Symmetry: D2
C-alpha cells in the first residue's frame, strides 16, 4: 500500500534561509524511509523547477517541492499546462507559503515532510488568466519600497503580505475604473483594489476575501470601491473576514481604462484586460486532513 511508486523531490537550495545540509537532515530522511524510489534534484536557476516538472511529469507519481511561493508557482506553471499531472506536495521553504497553509501543511519542515508520508490527497482547483495559471490570487492595485529594510520585509512577507502590513497607513491610494463581467452579469465602478482569489490564505494569514475554498469549483471576486478605502483599512485591522463588492463566479473578464500590470502567485508578465477561468480539480495535492 502506497499511491506513489516513484517520487521526485525538487529542492531549492536557497529555501529555509539557505542552511542546506540542516534543511536536508529535516526533510529527506522521512521521505527516503517511506518512499523506496526517490529522486532528489536541486534547482540552480530561475525556471529550473518548471523544467524539472515538465521533464518528470510523465515519469513519477509524486512531485514534492521544497521552496517558497515562487518555487511553488514555478511548479504550478510547469504542471498545469500538461496532459499528465502527478500529485504535488509542498514543503514550505519561504516565509509566506500561502498554498501550503491552504493545504493545512505544518510550517515546520520536518513535520511537512512526515505529512507527505501519510499520502492524504485531495483535488485542487487551478485558475487560469489569459493562459497564465495560478493557485492563490490574481490582483490589481497591490503595487513602493524605500530601502533595504522595507525591501527585506517585502521579500520576507511577499507582495500581498507586504500590502496588508502597510494598507492601514497608505495615504491617498490610486483609484481606477474597472469593468468586470462574471457569468453573464456586470460590475462597473471606480476601484482601489480588484482581486480574484483561489487560495484560502493570502499573505500568510487566512484570506481577507471571505469564505474562499480552493476546491469548490468557483472563484471569488473581491473589489474595494474608491469610496471604501477607510472601511477596508478597518476591515483588515479587525481580521474578521466575513461578507466592498464580493461575489463567486466561474468565468470572469476584467477590463480597465489603460493596460494595468497584474500581480499573482509569483513573477509574471500578465496585464489587463484578462479573461479568467477555473480548472476544477486540475491538481491533486498532498494535504493535512486533520487541519484543513
Amino acid at each position: 500500500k502506497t499511491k506513489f511508486e516513484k517520487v521526485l523531490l525538487i529542492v531549492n537550495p536557497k529555501a529555509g534561509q539557505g542552511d542546506l545540509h540542516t534543511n536536508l537532515t529535516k526533510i529527506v530522511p522521512p521521505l527516503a524511509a517511506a518512499f523506496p524510489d526517490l529522486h532528489i534534484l536541486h534547482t540552480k536557476e530561475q525556471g529550473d523547477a518548471t523544467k524539472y516538472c515538465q521533464e518528470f511529469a510523465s515519469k513519477v507519481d509524486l512531485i514534492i517541492v521544497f521552496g517558497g511561493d515562487g518555487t511553488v508557482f514555478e511548479c504550478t506553471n510547469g504542471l498545469a499546462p500538461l496532459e499528465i499531472r502527478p500529485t504535488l506536495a509542498i514543503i514550505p521553504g519561504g516565509t509566506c507559503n500561502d498554498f501550503s497553509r491552504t493545504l493545512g501543511v505544518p510550517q515546520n519542515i520536518a513535520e511537512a515532510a512526515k505529512l507527505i508520508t501519510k499520502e492524504h490527497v485531495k483535488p485542487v482547483d487551478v485558475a487560469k488568466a489569459n493562459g497564465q495559471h495560478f493557485l492563490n490570487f490574481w490582483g490589481i492595485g497591490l503595487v513602493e519600497v524605500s530601502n533595504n529594510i522595507d525591501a527585506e520585509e517585502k521579500a520576507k512577507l511577499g507582495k500581498i503580505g507586504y500590502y496588508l502590513s502597510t494598507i492601514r497607513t497608505v495615504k491617498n491610494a490610486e483609484t481606477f475604473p474597472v469593468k468586470i463581467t462574471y457569468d453573464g452579469q456586470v460590475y462597473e465602478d471606480e476601484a482601489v483594489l480588484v482581486m480574484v482569489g483561489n487560495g484560502e490564505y493570502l499573505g500568510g494569514i487566512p484570506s481577507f476575501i471571505p469564505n474562499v475554498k480552493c476546491d469548490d469549483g468557483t472563484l471569488d471576486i473581491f473589489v474595494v470601491k474608491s469610496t471604501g478605502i477607510q472601511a477596508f483599512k478597518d476591515y483588515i485591522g479587525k481580521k474578521l473576514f466575513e461578507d466592498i463588492f464580493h461575489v463567486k463566479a466561474k468565468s470572469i473578464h476584467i477590463e480597465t481604462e489603460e493596460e494595468k500590470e497584474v500581480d499573482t502567485d509569483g513573477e509574471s508578465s500578465l496585464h489587463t484586460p484578462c479573461q479568467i477561468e477555473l480548472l476544477q480539480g486540475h491538481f491533486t495535492m498532498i494535504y493535512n486532513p486533520a487541519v484543513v
Copy 2:
C-alpha cells in the same frame, strides 16, 4: 553536420487514408537511413500525440508528425506551452494539411520524408489566444461530410456562396463594428489553398487581423470567387477581441476557446523543417 542526434516519429495510423503498411514503406526507410537514432510511436486515441510530445520534448531533438491538421494541432498544443521545444516537422497525412503547405512541404508523403533528411530549419511564430496556441488561424463567424475531408475553414470556403454580430478589437488602437467574419491569421495557407487573408507570413513577427463587415458580404463572396488575394485588414502583435455575447471560436483543430480573447504572438517559438525551394 546533423542537427538532430535523436528523432521521434509520431504516426497516426489512420492518416494517409489508413493504408498503414504502405504509408510506412514510403516514410520510414528514408528517415531510418538518415537518422541513426529513430523512435517510432503510433497514436491510439485522441490526445496521444500531445502526450508523446510532452514526454519526449526533453529527450529528442526532432519530432516528426505523420497526420492531418488535427494531429499537427495536438503537437502544437503539446509543445507550445513547454520551456524546451525541439524542432518539429510534418509529413502530411490528412486532406488539408495547411501548415505543411506553409512550410513548402510536398504533399507526396515519401517526398515529405526525404525533405526532412535535408534538415532545412526555420523559426516559426506561434500564436496564443487566452492560453490556447495556434499555427494557422483563429476565427469567429465560420458557421455534407465533405466538411471532415476539407476541414472547418476549407468547408466554409467551399460553401460561402447571413448572421451579423458586434465586435470590438483592440490592437497595439481600436476597431468597432458589425461583422460577419473575424479572423486572425498566422498560416500562409487556409483551407488547403493560399490564405485569403493577404500577405500573411508565419515568421514576420506580427499577426494579421481580417474582418468582413456586415455591409461587405457580397464583396467577400466575389473576392473568394476570384482567388486574387491582395474589408478591414491590419497587422498587429497584441490583440483583444470582444463580442456582445460569448461566441465560440474556431481554430486549427478541436478546442473549447470562446470570446472574449487576448491574442499574443510568440515570435520564433517553434523551429520547423521546411522546403527552401518553395519561394
Copy 3:
C-alpha cells in the same frame, strides 16, 4: 502482443551495405506491427553489446540486423545480465548460423515478417570460462574466409588440408590424440546443418565431438557426404585440457584459450523462431 516495446539494432554494413534498400525491406513490417519501435544503428565494434546492455531493462524485444559477429555482440551483451528480453535475428551476414537454427528465412523481408508472428521459444546459452556462446566452441579449426566465417571456411577446405586432449564430462573422462575438438550448441554450423549429429539448442545438454588423430580420412569423407548421423557424447558440465595452451574459436572475436570449463545455461534466452 507479447512485446510492448521493441528495439531494432541495425548494423549499417549488413546485407552488403545497401542501407536504404535493406531498411525498405525490414523496417515497414516491424513498424506496422509494433507501435513502439526504436531503431539504433551501430557505428563501432562493441555498439551492439552496449545497446543490449543499456536497453535490456527497457524493452521487451531486441531485434538484431547483422551477421554472426553482430549476433555474438548481442549474445555477449545480454547473456551476463539478470534481465534478458527476447531476442530475434534478421540475417545480415553470409553465414547467419543461429538464425538458421531458429528456422529464420534468409530473405530479410521474410525474416522481418516472421518476427511479427511472435513465435518464441527458450534457447540454451553455453558458457566457457565466463565467455558465452550460441553456436560452438572448438579447437583445431581471405575473401572466402571472411564470407564463409571461420567454421564455414574450415569445412570448405578440410577435404584438402594433432594434439593431446583430456575431457572430463559429468564425472567421466576421455583422453586421446585429437585433430578437432568441438562443443556444439547450434543446429547449424558454417551455414549448413551441424556436422555434429542431433544437436538441439534447447535440450539442456551440450554435444562434445572429437575427431581422433587416426580418424582424419574418415572425417573428410563424413564431411563430403553431408549425412550427419570417433567420439560424440552429450554432457552438461565439461572441462577440456590440452598439453599446452591452445587458442579457441567460437561464434565471433574472442580471447579464449584452454584450459576451459564449459557450462550450459538452460533456457537462458527466449528467441523468435519459425515453427514451420
Copy 4:
C-alpha cells in the same frame, strides 16, 4: 567542480542492523547536500542491487551502495560484466565490510557518506574466476550450535572460518593442481586461496602483502602437513611471509582438484572447481580514503 553529475544510492533497508530511518538520517543528508542529482533506491529482494546496477550503469556517474559484503558483491556482479561501469562507493552496512576496509572507508556510516563527498577515486583490480567476478577472495577448504550460527552470520564465511580454525580437529585434505603463469604447484592441501582484498574477515589479510591494485593476484596454499603451523600463524596475527605454506603472486591461474569442490567467494555463488582465474586490471574506479590509503 564535481566528477559526478548524477548519483545513485542503493539502500539495503536491512543493513546497519535495520534501523532504517536512523541510518538514512546519517547517510542521506551529506550526499544530498553535495550531489544536486541524487536517486535513492531501496532493494526489496536478493538480486535487486545487481539489477539496479545493470539498469543504471549507463545512466549515472556514481553508484553508492549501503550494505554489507553481500550487497557489495551484488554490485560487483552487476557492474563487472558491463562495457560501461561508473565509479562505485561503499557505505559499510554489514558487520564485516571487507572491501570498504580495503578502501580505507571509515566504519562509521555518517563518516563513510561524508568521505564520498570528497570524491577521491582510484582504480581497483577485479578478479574473474570462470566468469564469476570477485573483489576480496576465492577459496576452497573454508556451525556446531546456535551460537556458531549467529556468529557465522555476523562475521561472514571467511570471518567465521578464522574465528574457529584454531579448533578444527581433523580437517579434510585434498589434492590440488595449480598452474600459474606457466609454472605448476601440485600437492595435498587443506586450504587454497586466491586473494585480491587487503582485508579478509574484518581484519588485515592473512595472505601477506595483498594489494587490490598491483595488477597481480596472490595464491596462498596451506599444505596438509601445515595445519598446526597455520593455526599458530592465525593466532599470532603477524601476516608476513616465513614454511609448509605456499604463497606466490600471479596473473593467470588455473586450479584443479580430484573431484569438483565447492568454492567460497565474496558472497553467495555456485562456483566450483575446476577454475580459470584472471585479473582485470583497473576494472573498477572506486571512492577511497587517501588519508588512510
